[PDB]
Nucleic acid binder design. Sequence first.
DNA 1: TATAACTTCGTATAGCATATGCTATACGAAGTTAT
DNA 2: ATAACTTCGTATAGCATATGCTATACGAAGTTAT
DNA 3: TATAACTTCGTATAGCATATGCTATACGAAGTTAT
DNA 4: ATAACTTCGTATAGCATATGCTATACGAAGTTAT
Lengths: 309, 305, 309, 305
Amino acid sequence: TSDEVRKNLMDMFRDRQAFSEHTWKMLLSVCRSWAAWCKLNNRKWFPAEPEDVRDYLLYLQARGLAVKTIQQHLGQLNMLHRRSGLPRPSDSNAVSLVMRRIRKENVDAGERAKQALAFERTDFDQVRSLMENSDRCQDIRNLAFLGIAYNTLLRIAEIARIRVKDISRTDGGRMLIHIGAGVEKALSLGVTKLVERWISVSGVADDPNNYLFCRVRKNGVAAPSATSQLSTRALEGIFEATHRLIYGAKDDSGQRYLAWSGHSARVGAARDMARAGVSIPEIMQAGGWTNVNIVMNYIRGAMVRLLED
Amino acid sequence: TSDEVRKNLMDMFRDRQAFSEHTWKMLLSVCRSWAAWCKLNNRKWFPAEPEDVRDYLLYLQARGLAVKTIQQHLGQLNMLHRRSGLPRPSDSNAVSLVMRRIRKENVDAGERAKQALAFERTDFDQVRSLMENSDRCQDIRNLAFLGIAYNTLLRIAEIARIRVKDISRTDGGRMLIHIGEKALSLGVTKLVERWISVSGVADDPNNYLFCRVRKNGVAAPSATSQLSTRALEGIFEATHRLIYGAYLAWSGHSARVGAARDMARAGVSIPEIMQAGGWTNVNIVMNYIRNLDSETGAMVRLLED
Amino acid sequence: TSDEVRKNLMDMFRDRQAFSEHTWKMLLSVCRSWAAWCKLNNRKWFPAEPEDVRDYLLYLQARGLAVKTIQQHLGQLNMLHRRSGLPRPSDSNAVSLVMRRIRKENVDAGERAKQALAFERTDFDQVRSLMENSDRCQDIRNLAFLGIAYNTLLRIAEIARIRVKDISRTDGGRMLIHIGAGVEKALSLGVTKLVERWISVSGVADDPNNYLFCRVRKNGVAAPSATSQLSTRALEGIFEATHRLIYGAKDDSGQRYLAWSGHSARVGAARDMARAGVSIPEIMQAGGWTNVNIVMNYIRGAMVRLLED
Amino acid sequence: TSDEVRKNLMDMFRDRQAFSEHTWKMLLSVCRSWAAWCKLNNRKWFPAEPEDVRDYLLYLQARGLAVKTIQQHLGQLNMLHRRSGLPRPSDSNAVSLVMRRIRKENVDAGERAKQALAFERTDFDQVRSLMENSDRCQDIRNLAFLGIAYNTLLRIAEIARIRVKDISRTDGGRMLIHIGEKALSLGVTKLVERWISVSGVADDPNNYLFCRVRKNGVAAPSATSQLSTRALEGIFEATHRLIYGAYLAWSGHSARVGAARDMARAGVSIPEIMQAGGWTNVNIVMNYIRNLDSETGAMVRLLED
DNA sequence: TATAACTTCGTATAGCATATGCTATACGAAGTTAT
DNA sequence: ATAACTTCGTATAGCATATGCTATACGAAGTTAT
DNA sequence: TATAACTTCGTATAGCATATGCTATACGAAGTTAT
DNA sequence: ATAACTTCGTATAGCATATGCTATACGAAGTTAT
């Protein structure tokens, strides 16, 4: 294949918006490291040579990256090749076996996927109990955001996307939110008030095409916008700040999940629903998950009872 | 091999009973619109070249059409090309890409499905009261229809097909409706009679239940032709314009949506709402009863003690 | 393809036991009618010509056969072609469209799949209430068979296959039966006695490798066998006889399902479990069904209540 | 292209860590048995010709082997042929046919999976009583094991891996077990101690919990080598031969099966029996608790009023 | 014997399961080391 | 003219799906200890 | 101004959905028939 | 010799799986009304 490859590649970039901005972000990323690696070793980065890719994967493993990370590089590589006509590195025994070997040894050595710290009902009550009394715009928002996070289990990006017009109400007085027909998420009577209070303190409702959450400057003034949203990077800040607020500084180990993050309310809610007897699938749906293992990991005497009697 | 596709269009025309007239019309409709776009932009419409179709699809997106619509177009174009030894345009990667992009792009722009305006018990009551004591042969027809609809939760094409004999009786007076069965409440059953008499469709069991009513308050019963579905739709619309003046009004399925909801509030086994309008996608029925208060979720339930 | 076809066909017959005896039975059957038809019309039955197959399908339709029957012929034909190398008639627009057209017109004309007459709990109680008092071997068996049919919902062929050795018991005294590891079916206390009574009146237990149900001659003497079983044709007789016993002769319309048959206990049990509130999947499993529609067809005021108040 | 497959066997050997030693042994095992059959019947074993393999599979069926076993054979043969530019034998239609026939044929003949002899509370009690007051260093070990097993519902390879420090304490005395966590009852926790002392594995936290016990009632604690799984299996067997004399006895997973059952009788959330032995196939756990009386079914329930 | 009670047989038509391998345990049994 | 539809064209929402088998349904004809 | 409170950016790593068409209804609106 | 294993070979039972994406995690660097 020749001009074909250059053309197949050319078609991709044209309709690049068929993929998520993050897929592109990662593609380019993995490519930079793949090329960097090839460079430092006198090798042709495209098309990728199986034996080269193998060496590369073993190099990342050796760099101590996570199995799911190594899987990513291999994947983007595979994406770049399929999408362009040529055969994928995963097509060769060398890459395929080494991947599985890399997976096996890491797991065998104890490496496991890190889980997020939960932001449960209790945590919400405490946070609420504390910030409930603030007049600060910053706080009224943060409290309203955490409430929505918890109540709905919506990904931070989904919350950051919410538009005022997307806010229906129910005959109960209970707020409702549409996530793109899509899905309707109903807030409790208590959270609806939290959101009501932030809506009335920022004046985001001054334009139904405005995003519900917006930045709030140091002088306690909201900056609504219908074109730009609050960075999910910031929604993550609200989670981290609120945690510092209560538990202070993060131990300098550098590890992940030493404070709340995007997942926190989701994983936390899954547990409360569990302890409360909710049905597993009930849980699944709410969290938008498709599988039973994701919800299960999040939740973790039987025999010790039978015996003792 | 041009004889190859020729033979196929003959095949297609010979066994056209393999598809619904409806389905066909949509097809001719797509070929019509596509062909025109092709003429206007000097491109060969048949066989449709991928790059040409991709351009077309990008065009429809600008037309402002929904994804389900643009896919209708891509879909029909895909049908005949397959029902001819030709490669379907979705089998090109350029079209696969645009269809994928067009989607995300559109959802991001804020793509929302249409919402049917519900016709709940509350509205039925208000309409009943308003034209309950009316003599206009039409009003009587219109109410008995609004009744059959909200009660049977039947589809309009189905109600238009009802004849004088699909009816059976069973309890206290109320009738039953054979179908392609249904039970009517007593309140509505009392309605579907006043219409039957002051219409005289009873005069012939072959005659359809619902029929035309010329401007003279005079019904034209018949067993040959039946009230168009669009006409039944007009009863829903009209009735609305009657109460609120000129998916903003009511349509053929406002009664189905309204019944599910009213039931959902008296709390009803969700699958028991499938009996209602013969449904699937336990979700579609949800997409109706979503903003209900009993459908708030365990989270709401948990949070409020 | 040439000798290849003759070889592919030759491989099939060699390992013909890879298919059910019924599949073979039908293949040969459909082939006889296909050839008969081709013959009467001066045509080559193999390989089959699409336009010929179309004519054939329209001929069966015109003969008034059931859509599912016409689907069968088309299917066996397709089986014979794929399995032998050549392309299947369903591969041509003519066959494919005509099938769908045939399906459409029949259904549009009202033709629908006939369902079996149910043999429910009440029916069982009555039958039991009547035959309970017989000493006749014939009856003690028939009653024990109907009981198993109802209690377990096992296909008649599965019952006819049951071997004495396949009969475990529970700590309750309740009989248990294994259907080939497989599946265990537990009989109630009442049915276990019925089966106990037939086991003790025939002496089938004189050899664990014997089939539970066996023929019983006119002189009330069981004929156990571990090699031969009671024909499912007979298990169907037990169902028909018991019905005649209670409702007398079948109206000479000739139609199917004017008396109980193999399905009867299955379809009947599905209903009782329904009316009793059993879960849909619960039902499914017991009947061995994989789908929700099969169990639903078997079971068939909402709004009439809301309105009337 | 013989270099093509050569490169592949090099690939396979280089990254052999991609598979478990166990998995490999089974493979060498299959190649061993196959190769021999090939030599004996003068057929080329590599690449394996379909007709040759079909004959082989038909041979194994006569050997009396189970379908899961014959498929093991067909499976491994399929693996290397794919991990070499060669066509897998299952990719022939002759082998596909026999594998299919062999199946039905075998199920018809009466193919039943093996049944694990359960080690229930009743048996644990009987064994406890019998060697509760014994001094033999082994007996103490054996009981503490039978305890850990029925209590933790752990797999044998997992119990063999237990060290002196995976243990944690939590309530009244009972210990906890870190794992690849577990909680022990008080009764068993009292047992797992007598073993720890009269063994002195405590002397070193690296030492494994369970260890060898030479014929002199003398334990050989160690943190380098661990008790083989087979040894743990022997404790289950021996203990049985002790009570009933010489799937007839108990095996490495009789304790797991027994615990599920005993629990199932005290009625236990079926998924809550997955906590027990980390299970899936809600059915496998069923295939254990099947002949239980609470697992009779709604039919039984309905029939008995 | 005539006959119940089947079995077998062919055409019509209804009711389903859609996987495979990697890795663990099974269990007789040859191999090994310290009593 | 105009009420009251019907027919049109095209938008878009709501329902199951396809094979490839394997098994029952039932009248009739053949079989065997009585 | 210094600065809160972000936004953007790149590498690391966790969490999912896997369809498409046939046929019905939608709804403005041109076409038709009897008042 | 023999108890008590360990190592072997091969039978057979019990557990999740593979892509192809798309999204969060978080330190750090760049940006803007205060």
